């Protein structure tokens, strides 16, 4: 695609600021999935 | 074409059906065939506790209108309100702010904040709920916003139970390259 | 003397991170499965 960008640049006649060609992934995902769970059931141990 | 110049700050108690508006008008104008009315009027609805500010200067295309709406939904058993703010250039809301409060003193407690911008695709959401109960209090967090191909979401939920105690938190911040490119113009009117 | 001891519940934890070119998951569980029967199974697993 930079080849076509250069071909456009040959006449020094661009249409956009910069090069809209994107090397990076189309989707950029950053996520955090954390959880804390504890079973404090009321049951108990009887001791003598 | 003009007989005189007068600047006046005239107060008027205007009627809006049920409501009464303490209207104060500040106008600077020429008097005669030529009118130079540059008016800065400000109106308050003391029956709907609503404030409105108005300015007109056609020479510079000024027809700005700002409204601050407060609507009372509060009662002894429920403290509730609804806030609206209309940012209207040329009387067109290009920025709007809304809030909804619905707090049931018994169990429910709702808070909701919204930001919306139509022309810039900028939207922010801040919503909170707290369902009280003597046995336990249930908490919910909602805060999200979207603008120029960027999605922001924050979801944190906690709950207590005698059997177990449960807590979670999910963080979401995703961006799509093509979607952001389309949403954010990479082209200018006269640049090509 | 008679004493009642609340159980040491089962602890569940996991944080899973997902980013472009690198998805990572963590999962550990702790806490006695049965306080009054003395059963422990605490286990972890880290994966990148």
Swiss-Prot record, chain B:
Lipid attachment locations (S-palmitoyl cysteine): 103
Residue ranges crossing the lipid bilayer per the database entry: none
Domain of life: Eukaryota
Protein name: Apolipoprotein B-48
Organism classification: Eukaryota, Metazoa, Chordata, Craniata, Vertebrata
Gene from which the chain derives: APOB
């Amino acid at each position: 695609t930079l080849q076509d960008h250069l071909n456009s640049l040959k006449e020094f006649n661009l249409q956009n600021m910069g090069l809209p060609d994107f090397h990076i992934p189309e989707n950029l995902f950053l996520k955090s999935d954390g959880r804390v769970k504890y079973t404090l059931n009321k049951n108990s141990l009887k001791i003598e | 074409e003009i007989e005189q110049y007068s600047v006046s700050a005239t107060y008027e108690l205007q009627r809006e059906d049920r409501a009464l508006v303490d209207t104060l008008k500040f106008v600077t104008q020429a008097e005669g065939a030529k009118q130079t009315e540059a008016t800065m009027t400000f109106k308050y609805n003391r029956q709907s506790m609503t404030l409105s500010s108005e300015v007109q200067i056609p020479d510079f295309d000024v027809d700005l209108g700002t409204i601050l709406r407060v609507n009372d939904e509060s009662t002894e058993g429920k403290t509730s309100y609804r806030l609206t703010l209309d940012i209207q250039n040329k009387k067109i809301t290009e920025v709007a702010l809304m809030g909804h409060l619905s707090c049931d003193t018994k169990e429910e407690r709702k808070i909701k904040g919204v930001i919306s911008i139509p022309r810039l695709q900028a939207e922010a959401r801040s919503e909170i709920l707290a369902h009280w109960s003597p046995a336990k209090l249930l908490l919910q967090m909602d805060s999200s916003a979207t603008a120029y191909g960027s999605t922001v979401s924050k979801r944190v939920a906690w709950h207590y139970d005698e059997e177990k105690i449960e807590f979670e938190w999910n963080t979401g911040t995703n961006v799509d390259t093509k979607k952001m490119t389309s949403n954010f113009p990479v082209d200018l009117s006269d640049y090509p | 003397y008679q004493l009642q001891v609340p159980l040491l519940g089962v602890l569940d934890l996991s944080t899973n991170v997902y980013s472009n070119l690198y998805n990572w998951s963590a999962s550990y569980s702790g806490g006695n499965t049965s306080t009054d029967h003395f059963s422990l199974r605490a286990r972890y697993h880290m994966k990148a």
